[PDB]
Amino acid sequence: KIFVGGLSVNTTVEDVKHYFEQFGKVDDAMLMFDKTTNRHRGFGFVTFESEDIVEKVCEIHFHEINNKMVECKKA
Hints:
Elements: E1 2-5, H1 13-21, E2 28-29, E3 43-47, H2 51-59, E4 71-74
Antiparallel strand pairs: 1-3, 1-4, 2-3
């Protein structure tokens, strides 16, 4: 599974899930925000057996979540 941060506002898992789904299989794709505080930054846990993408997508320091430059690491 991989890790991600920069969870913009309103952005919902369906965003990361479909985002990395095109990057790999992605059977799981979650995002963690803040209780009654979906405004600050957070971190989501995705998972695509495709290690290949994990290889690069992990080094990326500014991915693109629909309209933001979140980040993605390996786990």
